[PDB]
Amino acid sequence: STKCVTIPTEMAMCNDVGYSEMRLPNLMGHTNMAEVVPKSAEWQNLLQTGCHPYARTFLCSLFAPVCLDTFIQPCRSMCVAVRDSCAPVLACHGHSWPESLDCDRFPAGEDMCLDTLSKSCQGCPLIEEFFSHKTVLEAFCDNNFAVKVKLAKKKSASGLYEYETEGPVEFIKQGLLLPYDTRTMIEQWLLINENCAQKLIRTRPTVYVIAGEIHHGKVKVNRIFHWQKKDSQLTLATRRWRHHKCAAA
């Protein structure tokens, strides 16, 4: 029916939250630790960002409720705070706030609940057209990656529009990742920023030089340079990048 188990060291989410014994089944419905531990480990990437100081203990009140006490849910206030602070980070990871954590399921008003002690990647930069290769090189130095990509619009079976890279991607500045991983992050950014991709399709030709940052599986495009058919400045900047000395080391 129900039992109490020791929080294992392998459960990094709740191995240092003030108590060592949890009750099963937990508030998430998990009936055994072979289910509790991996499902809790799915939150590790979000929790390592520090999106909200109460995210970890809020989650542990659900995944590892206190053994000897009756089940007390966290307050809807704390759910709304943690959700409003951490949901954009999950969106940057490509995820969304789970329906199982819909804050409307948590108590408010008279119902007793555990409360608090007290009371980014979505940017779409402009398409730069008349620019200097010195500005392009400055963007290269200021960003993690810089690539030459051709974008293409495509109609799916359901009638919706998909935006994809077409042909090979010419890498100018690789950054600290392999070109395969960088390109995978660029595709992820294209899917997450559908409005920005749609904006980029409207400028012909659809060839761009994009520069941005990649941090812990999050991709942010900072600069977008349009590659004209008779381009000179992007050509000069890309040919110069190999021998270019940045202003900062």
Q: Which residues bind Cl ion (CB under 5 A)?
A: 87-89, 91-92, 120-121, 126-127, 142, 144, 155, 175, 204-205, 218, 220, 222, 228-229
Nearer to Cl ion, 62 or 207 (CB): 207
* Residue 84 beta carbon to Cl ion: minimum distance, rounded to whole angstroms: 8
Report the residue number, 30 or 218, with the smaller CB distance to Cl ion.
Answer: 218
Q: Name which of 239, 241, 206, 197 is nearest 225 in CA terms.
A: 206
Residue closer to Cl ion, measured from CB, 28 or 91: 91
The sign one gets for the Cα dihedral 94, 100, 104, 110 is negative
Specify whether the CB–CB gap between 27 and 73 falls below 8 A. Answer: yes
Q: Which two tokens stand for residue 19?
A: 């108590």
Beta bridge partners of 223: 211
Between 67 and 87, whose beta carbon lies closer to Cl ion?
87
Q: How far is the CB of 38 from Cl ion (least distance, A)?
A: 24
Shortest approach of Cl ion to residue 12 CB, angstroms?
A: 21
What is the spatial distance between Cα 154 and Cα 129, in angstroms, rounded to a whole number?
25
We find the least distance from the C-beta atom of residue 109 to Cl ion, in angstroms, to be 26
DSSP β-ladder status, 170-173 and 161-165: unpaired
